[PDB]
């Protein structure tokens, strides 16, 4: 209920206060305004929703693990389960918000290829996140939509982008872990990961060093 500049300022202020729910609400409003976001506005929306959903992913993993270690106790496992489904509901609502913003504003208004591959990557990542907690009857559908968006962005990635470009290095990282984790295709995931890493070593300054380190850790642990 305020100017786009007023919402961006309140978003940055929420960012410095580490109140990611407020920043996410601000950037959601800014995107519902209809205009293309700037690189800064893009980055603020990404940080906001990624932190908001990451807290829930971390809590889900913790509570699921604790779900595993229920031995001889119905009510303990029942409590851990109901809490897991509470977290599950929050996780799904968040991802549905982010995917609705992606499909109704972000991707259609992307002028350059960079913006639209980034938004299709985020599309794949959030489908990813939903996939990890997917039940099984709708799981297949979510995985299908995940890989469709992921690969669609992938096709445009190595057609207009330099091997050093951090956005695709990240798209590659998320697609490889998609194949390894979400599905069970170690051969493909490691093939893609090593391909991207070697193409990057062949040819942002500090960003790529650490994303290649993440690639080397990934391949190191998968092999």
């Amino acid at each position: 209920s305020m100017d786009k500049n007023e919402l961006v300022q309140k978003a940055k202020l929420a960012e410095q206060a580490e109140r990611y729910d407020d920043m996410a609400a601000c950037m959601k409003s800014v995107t519902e305004q209809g205009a293309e976001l700037s690189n800064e506005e893009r980055n603020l929306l990404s940080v906001a929703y990624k932190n908001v959903v990451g807290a829930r992913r971390s809590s889900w993993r913790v509570v699921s693990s604790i779900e595993q270690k229920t031995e001889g106790a119905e009510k303990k496992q029942q409590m851990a389960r109901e809490y897991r489904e509470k977290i599950e509901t929050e996780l799904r609502d968040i991802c549905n918000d982010v995917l609705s913003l992606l499909e109704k504003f972000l991707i259609p208004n992307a002028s350059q290829a960079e913006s639209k591959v980034f938004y299709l990557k985020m599309k794949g990542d959030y489908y990813r996140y939903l996939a990890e907690v997917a039940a099984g009857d709708d799981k297949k559908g979510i995985v299908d939509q995940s890989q469709q968006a992921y690969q669609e962005a992938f096709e445009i990635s190595k057609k207009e982008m330099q091997p050093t470009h951090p956005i695709r290095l990240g798209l590659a990282l998320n697609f490889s872990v998609f194949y390894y984790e979400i599905l069970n295709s170690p051969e493909k995931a490691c093939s893609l990961a090593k391909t991207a890493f070697d193409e990057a070593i062949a040819e942002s300054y500090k960003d790529s060093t650490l994303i290649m380190q993440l690639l080397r850790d990934n391949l190191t642990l998968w092999t």
Partner: protein, 276 residues
Amino acid sequence: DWEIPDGQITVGQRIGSGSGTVYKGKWHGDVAVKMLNVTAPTPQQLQAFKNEVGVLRKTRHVNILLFMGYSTKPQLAIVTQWCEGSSLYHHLHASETKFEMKKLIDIARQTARGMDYLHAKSIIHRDLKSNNIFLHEDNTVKIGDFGLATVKSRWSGSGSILWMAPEVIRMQDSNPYSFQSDVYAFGIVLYELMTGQLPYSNINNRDQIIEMVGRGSLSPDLSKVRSNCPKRMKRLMAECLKKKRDERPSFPRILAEIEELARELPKIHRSASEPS
């Protein structure tokens, strides 16, 4: 040679006890002062203090608490560098400071460097424990409290028992202490680093612990080592904790193993996606 005249050291607040009582002091900056609160030292305390000064005057290493001088006039006193921070015992069991595996490895490596230096100068610490390891600026390891330390020259001069090796606890013979007893104490401090807790956690009493470790019936539970602890480190601690002195490794190769493992850096316990 290193004696500090009376009056030069302004002694501040009493901070605790050592093997004497420890206070904070000002002498060309900050200093720590271990002092004995007695009018007239007995010949045994005076010989102990002279031995400790003799040992410390041979210690000159970044990971050894820097001895700076001694005083006799008011009371006998050893003065060292001041370390802002807490002992490793405090960090592990008194604040439960969440250390990353990298900093735990670095702390172990610096402790190993300190005891490599000490044993290379034929010094046995004989009381190496997590309480006698201090962190300077939560960054650097400093081995301290040489009150029970000695140099090895074929003669024996003589509550914190968790680090005591079975031979030491058994007391079969008059000279148990050796390089291997220090290595076993080191094994126990790596146990503390990799589990986060003290060994013999579930046996509560303190007296039975002695009988069980001396006999060999009880050894640290290596199943409480956390999963992100490198396998090499657990193997090395097992080697340092072996019940018979002669199968325990020496500090040069303990150091070499920690150094080699230093460089290996798996940040990834599990796989990891692109962050912000």
